Coordinates of C-alpha atoms and ligand atoms in Angstrom, one line a residue:
Chain A
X11 CA 0.0 0.0 0.0
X12 CA 0.9 3.7 0.0
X13 CA -0.8 4.4 3.2
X14 CA 0.3 2.2 6.1
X15 CA -0.9 3.0 9.6
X16 CA 1.6 3.1 12.5
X17 CA 1.3 -0.4 14.0
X18 CA 0.6 -0.9 17.6
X19 CA 2.7 -3.8 18.9
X20 CA 2.4 -4.9 22.6
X21 CA 3.9 -8.4 22.7
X22 CA 1.8 -10.6 20.5
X23 CA -0.7 -7.7 20.1
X24 CA 0.0 -6.4 16.6
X25 CA -2.6 -4.0 15.2
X26 CA -2.4 -1.9 12.1
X27 CA 0.4 -1.6 9.6
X28 CA 0.4 -4.8 7.5
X29 CA -0.9 -7.0 10.3
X30 CA -4.1 -9.1 10.1
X31 CA -7.4 -7.4 10.9
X32 CA -7.9 -7.5 14.6
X33 CA -11.4 -8.9 15.3
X34 CA -13.2 -8.1 18.6
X35 CA -16.3 -10.0 19.7
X36 CA -18.4 -7.5 21.7
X37 CA -20.0 -9.7 24.4
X38 CA -21.4 -6.4 25.8
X39 CA -24.3 -7.1 28.1
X40 CA -25.7 -10.1 26.2
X41 CA -24.7 -12.5 29.1
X42 CA -27.3 -10.8 31.3
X43 CA -25.0 -11.0 34.3
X44 CA -24.9 -14.9 34.1
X45 CA -21.2 -15.6 34.8
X46 CA -21.3 -19.2 33.4
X47 CA -22.8 -17.8 30.2
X48 CA -20.1 -15.2 29.9
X49 CA -17.5 -18.0 30.4
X50 CA -19.2 -20.0 27.6
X51 CA -19.1 -16.9 25.4
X52 CA -15.3 -16.8 25.9
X53 CA -14.9 -20.5 25.0
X54 CA -16.9 -20.2 21.8
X55 CA -15.4 -16.9 20.8
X56 CA -11.9 -18.5 21.1
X57 CA -13.1 -21.5 19.1
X58 CA -14.3 -19.0 16.4
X59 CA -10.7 -17.6 16.3
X60 CA -11.7 -14.0 17.3
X61 CA -8.7 -12.1 18.4
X62 CA -10.4 -10.6 21.5
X63 CA -13.6 -10.7 23.5
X64 CA -14.8 -7.4 25.1
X65 CA -17.1 -6.8 28.1
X66 CA -18.6 -3.7 29.7
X67 CA -17.6 -2.3 33.2
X68 CA -20.2 0.2 34.4
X69 CA -22.5 1.3 37.2
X70 CA -26.1 1.4 35.9
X71 CA -27.2 4.5 37.7
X72 CA -24.0 6.4 36.6
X73 CA -24.5 5.3 33.0
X74 CA -28.2 6.0 32.6
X75 CA -29.2 8.4 35.4
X76 CA -33.0 9.1 35.6
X77 CA -33.9 6.6 32.8
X78 CA -35.2 4.1 35.4
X79 CA -36.2 1.5 32.7
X80 CA -32.7 1.5 31.3
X81 CA -31.2 1.2 34.8
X82 CA -33.4 -1.8 35.6
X83 CA -32.6 -3.4 32.3
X84 CA -28.8 -3.3 32.7
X85 CA -28.6 -3.7 36.5
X86 CA -28.5 -7.5 36.3
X87 CA -25.7 -7.5 33.8
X88 CA -23.2 -5.7 36.0
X89 CA -20.0 -7.5 36.7
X90 CA -17.4 -6.6 39.2
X91 CA -13.7 -7.2 39.8
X92 CA -14.2 -10.8 41.0
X93 CA -16.1 -11.7 37.8
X94 CA -13.7 -9.9 35.5
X95 CA -10.8 -11.7 37.0
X96 CA -12.5 -15.0 36.3
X97 CA -13.3 -13.9 32.8
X98 CA -9.7 -12.7 32.2
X99 CA -8.4 -16.0 33.5
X100 CA -10.6 -18.1 31.2
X101 CA -9.6 -15.8 28.3
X102 CA -5.9 -16.4 28.9
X103 CA -6.5 -20.2 29.1
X104 CA -8.3 -20.1 25.8
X105 CA -5.7 -17.8 24.1
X106 CA -8.1 -15.0 23.4
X107 CA -7.5 -11.4 24.5
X108 CA -9.8 -10.1 27.3
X109 CA -10.7 -6.5 27.7
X110 CA -13.6 -4.2 28.6
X111 CA -15.2 -0.8 28.1
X112 CA -15.1 1.2 31.4
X113 CA -17.9 3.7 31.7
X114 CA -16.4 5.7 34.6
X115 CA -13.1 6.2 36.3
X116 CA -13.6 3.7 39.1
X117 CA -14.2 1.0 36.6
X118 CA -11.3 2.1 34.5
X119 CA -9.0 2.0 37.5
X120 CA -10.3 -1.5 38.3
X121 CA -9.6 -2.7 34.8
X122 CA -6.0 -1.4 34.9
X123 CA -5.5 -3.0 38.4
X124 CA -6.5 -6.5 37.1
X125 CA -4.0 -6.1 34.3
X126 CA -5.9 -5.3 31.1
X127 CA -3.6 -3.9 28.4
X128 CA -6.4 -2.4 26.2
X129 CA -9.3 -0.1 27.0
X130 CA -12.3 0.5 24.8
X131 CA -14.1 3.8 25.1
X132 CA -17.8 3.8 23.9
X133 CA -19.1 6.1 21.3
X134 CA -21.4 7.8 23.8
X135 CA -18.2 8.8 25.8
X136 CA -16.4 10.6 22.9
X137 CA -17.3 13.9 24.8
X138 CA -16.7 12.4 28.3
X139 CA -13.5 14.5 28.9
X140 CA -12.9 13.2 32.4
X141 CA -13.0 9.5 31.2
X142 CA -11.0 10.2 28.1
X143 CA -8.3 12.0 30.1
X144 CA -8.2 9.1 32.6
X145 CA -7.8 6.6 29.7
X146 CA -5.0 8.7 28.1
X147 CA -3.2 9.0 31.5
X148 CA -3.4 5.2 32.1
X149 CA -0.8 4.5 29.4
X150 CA -2.8 1.5 28.1
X151 CA -3.8 1.0 24.5
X152 CA -7.1 2.9 23.9
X153 CA -9.7 2.0 21.3
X154 CA -12.2 4.8 20.8
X155 CA -15.4 4.6 18.7
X156 CA -16.7 7.8 17.1
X157 CA -20.5 7.1 16.8
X158 CA -22.4 10.4 17.3
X159 CA -19.3 12.5 16.7
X160 CA -18.6 15.4 14.3
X161 CA -15.1 16.0 12.9
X162 CA -14.4 18.7 15.6
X163 CA -15.5 16.3 18.4
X164 CA -13.2 13.6 17.0
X165 CA -10.3 16.0 16.8
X166 CA -10.8 17.1 20.4
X167 CA -10.9 13.5 21.6
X168 CA -7.9 12.4 19.5
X169 CA -5.9 15.3 20.9
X170 CA -6.4 14.1 24.4
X171 CA -4.5 10.8 23.5
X172 CA -1.9 12.5 21.3
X173 CA -1.0 14.8 24.2
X174 CA -0.1 11.7 26.3
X175 CA 1.3 9.6 23.4
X176 CA -1.2 6.9 24.2
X177 CA -1.3 4.0 21.8
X178 CA -4.5 4.8 20.1
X179 CA -7.0 3.2 17.7
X180 CA -10.1 4.9 16.3
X181 CA -13.2 3.0 15.1
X182 CA -15.7 4.4 12.6
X183 CA -19.1 3.6 14.1
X184 CA -22.8 4.6 13.7
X185 CA -24.8 4.9 16.9
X186 CA -28.0 3.6 15.2
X187 CA -29.9 0.6 16.6
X188 CA -30.1 -1.4 14.5
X189 CA -27.9 0.3 11.9
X190 CA -29.4 0.2 8.4
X191 CA -27.3 -0.2 5.2
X192 CA -27.7 3.3 4.0
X193 CA -26.4 4.7 7.3
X194 CA -23.1 2.8 7.3
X195 CA -21.0 5.6 5.7
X196 CA -18.1 3.2 5.3
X197 CA -16.1 5.7 3.2
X198 CA -15.6 7.6 6.5
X199 CA -13.0 4.9 7.2
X200 CA -10.8 6.2 4.3
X201 CA -11.5 9.8 5.3
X202 CA -10.1 8.9 8.8
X203 CA -7.2 7.0 7.3
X204 CA -6.3 10.0 5.2
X205 CA -6.6 12.3 8.2
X206 CA -4.7 10.3 10.9
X207 CA -1.6 8.1 11.1
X208 CA -2.9 5.6 13.7
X209 CA -5.0 2.5 12.9
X210 CA -8.6 3.0 11.8
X211 CA -11.2 0.3 12.1
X212 CA -15.0 -0.2 12.3
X213 CA -17.5 -1.1 15.0
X214 CA -20.7 -2.7 13.7
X215 CA -24.3 -2.3 14.9
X216 CA -26.0 -4.0 11.9
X217 CA -28.0 -7.2 11.9
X218 CA -25.4 -9.2 9.9
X219 CA -21.7 -9.5 9.0
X220 CA -21.9 -8.2 5.4
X221 CA -21.4 -4.6 6.5
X222 CA -18.3 -5.3 8.6
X223 CA -16.9 -7.4 5.7
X224 CA -17.5 -4.5 3.3
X225 CA -15.8 -2.3 6.0
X226 CA -12.7 -4.5 5.7
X227 CA -12.7 -4.0 1.9
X228 CA -13.1 -0.3 2.5
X229 CA -9.9 -0.2 4.7
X230 CA -10.9 -1.2 8.3
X231 CA -7.9 -2.6 10.3
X232 CA -10.0 -3.6 13.3
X233 CA -13.5 -5.0 13.3
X234 CA -15.8 -5.0 16.4
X235 CA -19.1 -7.0 16.2
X236 CA -21.6 -7.6 18.9
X237 CA -21.7 -11.3 19.9
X238 CA -24.0 -13.8 21.5
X239 CA -23.8 -17.6 21.9
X240 CA -27.5 -17.9 21.0
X241 CA -30.0 -15.2 19.8
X242 CA -32.9 -17.4 20.9
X243 CA -32.0 -16.5 24.5
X244 CA -33.1 -12.9 23.6
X245 CA -30.4 -11.4 25.7
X246 CA -29.5 -7.7 25.6
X247 CA -28.5 -6.5 22.1
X248 CA -29.4 -10.0 20.6
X249 CA -30.8 -8.4 17.4
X250 CA -27.5 -7.0 16.4
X251 CA -25.3 -9.8 17.7
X252 CA -23.5 -12.5 15.7
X253 CA -23.7 -16.1 16.8
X254 CA -20.5 -18.2 17.0
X255 CA -20.7 -19.7 13.5
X256 CA -21.3 -16.2 12.1
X257 CA -18.4 -14.8 14.1
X258 CA -16.2 -17.6 12.7
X259 CA -17.4 -16.7 9.2
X260 CA -16.5 -13.1 9.9
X261 CA -13.0 -14.1 10.8
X262 CA -12.4 -16.3 7.8
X263 CA -14.1 -14.0 5.3
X264 CA -12.0 -11.1 6.7
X265 CA -8.9 -13.0 6.0
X266 CA -10.1 -13.8 2.5
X267 CA -10.9 -10.2 1.7
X268 CA -7.5 -9.1 3.1
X269 CA -5.9 -11.5 0.7
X270 CA -7.9 -9.9 -2.1
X271 CA -6.9 -6.4 -1.0
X272 CA -3.3 -7.5 -1.3
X273 CA -0.1 -5.5 -0.8
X274 CA -1.3 -2.3 -2.4
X275 CA 1.9 -1.6 -4.3
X276 CA 2.0 -0.5 -7.9
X277 CA 3.9 -3.5 -9.3
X278 CA 2.9 -6.5 -11.5
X279 CA 1.8 -9.8 -10.1
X280 CA 3.8 -12.9 -11.2
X281 CA 0.6 -14.2 -12.8
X282 CA 0.9 -11.3 -15.3
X283 CA 4.3 -12.3 -16.6
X284 CA 3.0 -13.8 -19.9
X285 CA 1.2 -10.6 -20.7
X286 CA 4.3 -8.6 -19.7
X287 CA 6.4 -10.7 -22.1
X288 CA 3.9 -10.1 -24.9
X289 CA 3.8 -6.4 -24.2
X290 CA 7.5 -6.1 -24.2
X291 CA 8.0 -8.1 -27.4
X292 CA 5.3 -6.3 -29.6
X293 CA 3.7 -3.3 -27.9
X294 CA 6.7 -1.0 -27.0
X295 CA 6.5 1.3 -30.0
Chain B
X29 CA -15.4 12.0 1.6
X30 CA -12.0 13.5 2.2
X31 CA -10.4 13.1 -1.2
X32 CA -12.6 13.4 -4.3
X33 CA -11.4 12.7 -7.8
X34 CA -11.8 15.5 -10.3
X35 CA -15.0 14.5 -12.2
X36 CA -15.1 14.1 -15.9
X37 CA -18.2 15.2 -17.8
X38 CA -19.4 14.2 -21.3
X39 CA -23.0 15.2 -21.9
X40 CA -25.3 14.0 -19.1
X41 CA -22.8 11.4 -17.9
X42 CA -20.2 12.4 -15.3
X43 CA -17.4 10.1 -14.1
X44 CA -15.6 10.4 -10.8
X45 CA -16.3 12.9 -8.0
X46 CA -19.5 11.8 -6.2
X47 CA -21.1 10.5 -9.4
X48 CA -22.5 6.9 -9.6
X49 CA -20.0 4.2 -10.5
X50 CA -19.6 4.0 -14.3
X51 CA -20.1 0.4 -15.4
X52 CA -18.6 -0.8 -18.7
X53 CA -19.7 -4.1 -20.3
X54 CA -16.6 -5.3 -22.3
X55 CA -18.0 -7.3 -25.2
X56 CA -14.4 -7.8 -26.2
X57 CA -14.1 -10.4 -28.9
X58 CA -16.8 -12.6 -27.4
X59 CA -19.1 -12.0 -30.4
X60 CA -16.6 -13.9 -32.6
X61 CA -17.3 -11.4 -35.4
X62 CA -21.0 -12.3 -35.6
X63 CA -22.6 -8.8 -36.2
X64 CA -26.1 -10.0 -35.1
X65 CA -24.7 -11.4 -31.9
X66 CA -22.9 -8.2 -31.2
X67 CA -26.1 -6.3 -31.7
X68 CA -27.9 -8.6 -29.3
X69 CA -25.1 -8.0 -26.8
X70 CA -25.8 -4.2 -27.0
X71 CA -29.6 -4.8 -26.5
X72 CA -29.1 -7.0 -23.4
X73 CA -26.4 -4.8 -21.9
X74 CA -28.8 -1.8 -22.2
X75 CA -31.5 -3.9 -20.6
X76 CA -29.1 -4.7 -17.7
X77 CA -28.6 -0.9 -17.2
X78 CA -24.8 -0.9 -17.9
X79 CA -23.6 2.6 -18.6
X80 CA -21.5 1.6 -21.6
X81 CA -20.7 -1.3 -23.9
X82 CA -17.2 -1.6 -25.3
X83 CA -15.7 -3.3 -28.3
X84 CA -12.2 -3.8 -29.7
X85 CA -10.9 -2.2 -32.9
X86 CA -7.7 -3.8 -34.2
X87 CA -5.8 -5.5 -37.0
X88 CA -5.0 -9.0 -36.0
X89 CA -1.5 -9.1 -37.6
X90 CA -0.5 -5.8 -36.1
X91 CA -1.8 -7.0 -32.7
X92 CA -0.2 -10.4 -32.5
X93 CA 2.8 -10.4 -34.9
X94 CA 4.3 -13.8 -35.7
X95 CA 2.0 -15.6 -33.2
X96 CA 0.1 -17.3 -36.0
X97 CA -2.2 -19.1 -33.6
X98 CA -3.3 -15.9 -31.9
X99 CA -3.8 -14.2 -35.3
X100 CA -6.0 -17.0 -36.5
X101 CA -8.0 -16.9 -33.3
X102 CA -8.9 -13.2 -33.4
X103 CA -9.1 -12.6 -37.2
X104 CA -12.8 -13.7 -37.4
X105 CA -13.7 -11.3 -34.6
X106 CA -12.4 -8.2 -36.4
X107 CA -15.0 -5.5 -37.1
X108 CA -14.4 -2.6 -39.5
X109 CA -15.8 0.9 -39.7
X110 CA -19.1 -0.2 -41.3
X111 CA -19.8 -2.6 -38.5
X112 CA -18.8 -0.2 -35.8
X113 CA -21.2 2.4 -37.3
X114 CA -24.0 -0.1 -37.0
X115 CA -23.0 -1.0 -33.4
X116 CA -22.9 2.7 -32.4
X117 CA -26.3 3.4 -34.0
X118 CA -27.8 0.5 -32.0
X119 CA -26.3 1.7 -28.8
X120 CA -27.7 5.2 -29.2
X121 CA -31.1 3.6 -30.0
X122 CA -30.9 1.5 -26.8
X123 CA -29.6 4.4 -24.7
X124 CA -26.2 2.8 -23.8
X125 CA -22.9 4.4 -24.5
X126 CA -20.8 2.8 -27.3
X127 CA -17.0 3.0 -27.4
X128 CA -14.0 0.8 -28.2
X129 CA -10.4 0.0 -27.6
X130 CA -8.2 0.9 -30.6
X131 CA -5.0 -1.1 -30.8
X132 CA -3.3 1.1 -33.5
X133 CA -3.5 4.7 -34.7
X134 CA -5.6 3.9 -37.8
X135 CA -8.3 2.3 -35.6
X136 CA -8.1 5.2 -33.2
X137 CA -8.6 7.7 -36.0
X138 CA -11.5 5.6 -37.3
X139 CA -13.2 5.6 -33.9
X140 CA -12.9 9.4 -33.5
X141 CA -14.2 9.9 -37.1
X142 CA -17.4 7.9 -36.4
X143 CA -18.0 10.1 -33.4
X144 CA -16.9 8.0 -30.3
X145 CA -16.3 10.2 -27.3
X146 CA -14.3 7.7 -25.1
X147 CA -11.2 5.7 -26.0
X148 CA -10.1 2.7 -23.9
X149 CA -6.4 1.8 -24.0
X150 CA -5.6 -1.9 -23.2
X151 CA -3.2 -2.8 -20.4
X152 CA -0.8 -4.3 -22.9
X153 CA -0.5 -0.9 -24.5
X154 CA 0.6 1.0 -21.4
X155 CA 4.1 1.2 -22.9
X156 CA 2.8 1.9 -26.5
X157 CA 4.0 5.5 -26.5
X158 CA 2.8 6.1 -30.1
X159 CA -0.7 5.0 -29.3
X160 CA -0.9 6.8 -26.0
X161 CA 0.3 10.1 -27.6
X162 CA -2.3 9.7 -30.3
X163 CA -5.0 9.1 -27.6
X164 CA -3.8 12.1 -25.6
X165 CA -3.8 14.4 -28.7
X166 CA -7.3 13.3 -29.7
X167 CA -9.1 15.3 -27.1
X168 CA -11.4 12.4 -26.3
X169 CA -11.9 10.9 -22.8
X170 CA -9.2 8.3 -22.4
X171 CA -9.5 5.3 -20.0
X172 CA -6.3 3.4 -19.5
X173 CA -5.8 0.1 -17.7
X174 CA -2.5 -0.5 -15.9
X175 CA -2.3 -4.3 -15.9
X176 CA 1.4 -5.4 -16.3
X177 CA 2.6 -2.0 -15.2
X178 CA 5.0 -0.8 -12.5
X179 CA 4.7 2.6 -10.7
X180 CA 7.3 4.1 -13.1
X181 CA 5.6 2.8 -16.2
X182 CA 2.2 4.2 -14.9
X183 CA 3.9 7.5 -14.3
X184 CA 5.4 7.6 -17.8
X185 CA 1.9 7.0 -19.3
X186 CA 0.2 9.4 -17.0
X187 CA 2.7 12.2 -17.9
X188 CA 1.7 11.9 -21.6
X189 CA -1.9 12.7 -20.8
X190 CA -1.0 15.4 -18.2
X191 CA 0.9 17.3 -21.0
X192 CA -2.1 17.4 -23.3
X193 CA -4.6 18.1 -20.4
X194 CA -6.6 15.1 -21.7
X195 CA -9.7 13.9 -19.8
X196 CA -8.1 10.8 -18.3
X197 CA -9.2 7.8 -16.2
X198 CA -7.0 5.1 -14.8
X199 CA -8.2 1.5 -14.1
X200 CA -6.4 -0.9 -11.7
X201 CA -6.2 -4.2 -13.5
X202 CA -4.4 -7.6 -13.3
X203 CA -3.5 -9.1 -16.6
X204 CA -4.2 -12.7 -15.6
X205 CA -6.9 -14.8 -17.3
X206 CA -8.8 -15.9 -15.3
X207 CA -7.4 -14.0 -12.4
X208 CA -7.3 -15.8 -9.1
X209 CA -8.9 -13.7 -6.3
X210 CA -5.6 -13.7 -4.3
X211 CA -4.0 -11.8 -7.2
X212 CA -6.5 -9.0 -7.3
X213 CA -4.5 -6.4 -5.2
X214 CA -7.5 -4.3 -4.8
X215 CA -5.8 -2.0 -2.3
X216 CA -3.9 -0.6 -5.4
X217 CA -7.0 1.4 -6.0
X218 CA -6.5 3.4 -2.9
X219 CA -2.8 3.7 -3.7
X220 CA -3.7 5.2 -7.0
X221 CA -6.4 7.5 -5.5
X222 CA -3.8 8.8 -3.1
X223 CA -1.2 9.4 -5.8
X224 CA -3.5 10.9 -8.5
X225 CA -6.4 13.4 -8.7
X226 CA -8.2 11.9 -11.7
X227 CA -10.9 9.1 -11.3
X228 CA -9.6 5.6 -10.5
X229 CA -11.4 2.5 -11.3
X230 CA -11.1 -1.3 -11.8
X231 CA -11.1 -3.6 -14.8
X232 CA -11.9 -7.2 -13.9
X233 CA -10.5 -10.4 -15.2
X234 CA -12.1 -12.8 -12.6
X235 CA -14.7 -15.5 -13.0
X236 CA -17.5 -13.6 -11.1
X237 CA -18.8 -10.3 -10.0
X238 CA -17.7 -10.6 -6.4
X239 CA -14.3 -9.1 -7.0
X240 CA -15.6 -6.1 -9.0
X241 CA -18.1 -5.5 -6.1
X242 CA -15.3 -5.6 -3.6
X243 CA -13.4 -3.2 -5.9
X244 CA -16.3 -0.8 -5.5
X245 CA -16.1 -1.1 -1.8
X246 CA -12.4 -0.4 -2.0
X247 CA -13.0 2.8 -3.9
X248 CA -13.4 2.0 -7.6
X249 CA -15.2 4.8 -9.5
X250 CA -15.4 2.9 -12.8
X251 CA -15.9 -0.9 -13.2
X252 CA -15.2 -2.8 -16.5
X253 CA -16.4 -6.4 -16.7
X254 CA -16.2 -8.8 -19.6
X255 CA -19.5 -9.7 -21.0
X256 CA -21.3 -12.4 -23.0
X257 CA -24.8 -13.3 -23.9
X258 CA -24.1 -17.0 -23.1
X259 CA -20.9 -18.6 -21.7
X260 CA -21.9 -21.9 -23.2
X261 CA -21.2 -20.6 -26.7
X262 CA -17.5 -20.7 -25.6
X263 CA -16.7 -17.5 -27.3
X264 CA -13.4 -15.8 -26.7
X265 CA -13.0 -14.8 -23.0
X266 CA -16.1 -16.8 -22.0
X267 CA -14.6 -17.9 -18.7
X268 CA -14.2 -14.3 -17.4
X269 CA -17.4 -12.9 -18.9
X270 CA -20.7 -12.1 -17.1
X271 CA -24.0 -13.1 -18.6
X272 CA -26.8 -10.5 -18.8
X273 CA -28.5 -11.4 -15.5
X274 CA -25.1 -11.2 -13.8
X275 CA -24.3 -7.9 -15.4
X276 CA -27.6 -6.6 -14.2
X277 CA -26.8 -7.8 -10.7
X278 CA -23.4 -6.1 -10.9
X279 CA -25.2 -2.8 -11.6
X280 CA -27.7 -3.1 -8.8
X281 CA -25.2 -4.4 -6.3
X282 CA -22.7 -1.6 -7.2
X283 CA -25.4 1.0 -6.4
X284 CA -26.2 -0.8 -3.1
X285 CA -22.5 -0.8 -2.1
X286 CA -22.2 2.9 -3.0
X287 CA -25.1 3.7 -0.7
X288 CA -23.3 1.8 2.1
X289 CA -20.1 3.7 1.4
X290 CA -22.0 6.9 1.8
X291 CA -20.7 10.4 1.6
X292 CA -17.5 10.0 3.6
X293 CA -18.0 13.1 5.7
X294 CA -17.3 13.0 9.5
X295 CA -20.7 14.0 10.6
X296 CA -23.3 11.8 12.3
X297 CA -26.2 10.2 10.5
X298 CA -29.8 11.4 11.2
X299 CA -30.6 8.1 12.8
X300 CA -27.9 8.7 15.5
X301 CA -30.1 11.5 17.0
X302 CA -31.3 9.5 20.0
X303 CA -27.8 8.6 21.0
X304 CA -26.6 12.1 20.5
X305 CA -29.3 13.4 22.9
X306 CA -28.4 10.8 25.5
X307 CA -24.7 11.7 25.1
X308 CA -25.3 15.4 25.5
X309 CA -27.5 15.0 28.5
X310 CA -25.5 12.6 30.7
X311 CA -22.1 11.8 29.2
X312 CA -20.5 15.3 28.8
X313 CA -18.6 15.1 32.1
Ligands
MN417 MN1 -21.7 -1.4 20.4
MN418 MN1 -9.8 -7.1 -20.5

């Protein structure tokens, strides 16, 4: 390629540059607070060969305030340090990366204390200056999604991490539920890749995997997709969540599209040598 | 978007910029020199809503030299001026644009004389300085494919058209028949869009429409696809040619993927309004 993002390398973490697309299974709140179900989600995400599985670390009242129905809905799905330690341990055993989205500073501090190496910051927090500054100060790798955000809002958020030289990844994202095809605006990925030097990816909220695969073809270097072991359980966000076989197809189809994208250099392929020989023998005149 | 190519206009059709993808059905030599078959090809390409149908204007001996097998294969498919006039008349009647690839200056002059407004130059002629200079001096829209070519060979050809200020379009292309998907190097499209200001597209030599559709997702603003009424006739290039229903699907799927790509601006979609209001009321802390 011409454009190559500055890769983020932390041990075996290798994101951007000419590395494989980093695929995140967003378990989110779909486990409903069932710890055994969350552990099962890790097992089956590792079997699907996702690179990482992501959870959410939040206080319901802090997150939703006076929306009593939202509070009651997400209250059962809260996990604390003891559960996140068990989930991190199962993830290490199954060779899949564990991390989570903190929604406040106490949860961020807890995630750093249990040894996570990556933080996700949700789209709704792209203007949460206190939380962004705490993420930048942590020194950890930060993935920020830009759903809801204008170009100026993105620049303000990006500057917070540039100022601390945080390893930083930005995901194009549309905070629409569910996200329709005509709202994907996947060419924003290239707009961001032209504007910034760090890796750009895509976080999906559609009802399938076609849009994230198209996002890979349009340049995404990271893919985040909501994830469930079984939509029939009707857990939180089930409608936009991929089941394990669909996650596995996302992984293998991403690899296939990456092969099709190729090296990006302006040079002939060896499969063209017969036409090169013909060109050189008769058409140079 | 961020970058936009400088659009090219000819009548009511505009190529590049934020115009629809321009779709070319390459009839090639697949008609085998059967004029009635070539006329049917125009009818069915227009019904499929391709923007243009393209033919090839060549002398077999000039094109293939002492390769007597190749000369005998393509000699029956030669059309002359009288045939191209009939093909152009049919295209206008059916509301599809007609043009052709000249392989020598006599055929280029003939095409301009009968009123064609676009010239295609084949990948094998990207080092054919005499032909490229005649195309650049013609004043017509020139579409060039860069199969076989290195960056420096592309730059040499581009410089010819920059000097004459020709309306110019470049197609990424891999001169392999049929082209394996792992050879497609579709990220070369973005490399070319970053290097050059004129519209960049893709000429396909694969066995399906998936690769050209991925090329749209990777930024192609023009798609050329080989075309046949019926692969079972085993005409020249049958294996890489789309049949009319498949051409029609390429057209409608290209429009769908363009809608998914969107405008490329860093501004939220209207459907994100609920999440914006949530963000502004509770998460600006
Ligand atoms: Mn999400
Ligand atoms: Mn061709």
